Design a protein around this ligand. Sequence first.
Ligand code: 0JX
Ligand code: SF4
Length: 309
Amino acid sequence: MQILLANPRGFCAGVDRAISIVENALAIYGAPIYVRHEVVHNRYVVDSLRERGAIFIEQISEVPDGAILIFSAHGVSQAVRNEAKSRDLTVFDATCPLVTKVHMEVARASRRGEESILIGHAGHPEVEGTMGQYSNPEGGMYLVESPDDVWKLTVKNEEKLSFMTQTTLSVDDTSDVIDALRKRFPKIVGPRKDDICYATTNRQEAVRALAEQAEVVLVVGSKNSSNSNRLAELAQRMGKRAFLIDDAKDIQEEWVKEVKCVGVTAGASAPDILVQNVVARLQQLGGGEAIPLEGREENIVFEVPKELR
Ligand SMILES: O=P(O)(O)OP(=O)(O)OCC/C=C/O
Ligand code: SF4
């Protein structure tokens, strides 16, 4: 059994910064540090930090007066940011710079009273944060998930309209939604392509190359990691069996029985120790040395705030 490893895979620059932010806050100020929502969608990363006395909560009401609160890498609405400001809390913001960039565009559209369409998945905290940058009742902020949603959307002024995207979407699907928006709303204004970030594009491109060679693809990532799910979905649509797994214990022998080539990748929030343990388990079920595929180089790093050292 040949084991192939996708490249790039695993931590992106926003995740690495968000994890550092919490760790350094814990090191500067001690336990407890409160965090609103899982800092990133990875059970191991979360369990890690939690067992080291970060405390994860879903609402600012659960955080005590005088405490330190960190916002997750997915970002938060204006209302959440205001609710923390109107409380007694010291706040550090771990929102990824690439999410903040999309926030700034929505806020701009809002000030101008111009209507905005976000492409994204309803209920995801990034979508809640991003939609929550829009406050002008003169305009409007609308969410679409698919070409069908576009086909049924009506807006107040289609001459003054822009669109933005969630950063972790399927490159291919989003492209279909943009083609629909442009046909429905010829004057809509957006980015040249989308707001999908470099790490999301790169992991999709890497898993496409992997799935070309591998019969089965295992994607290391938690169930609620949107970007991890896109990697698995991509492989599946190429007709490969693909499984989203949190760790090596999830691997079922039947998945890899009589398989000549198995590929492994990891979502943007999954630590490399998890991939190492998965490779050790596949070697137990008969695979040889893991071979890394050649891939696009990534060179971007986002530093913690100078306050966090
Ligand atoms: O579920 P998502 O893909 O947004 O998040 P995850 O926490 O796994 O990865 C890092 C967050 C990406 C924000 O863009
Ligand atoms: S997936 Fe992209 S936008 Fe999201 S944290 Fe990573 S680098 Fe930032």
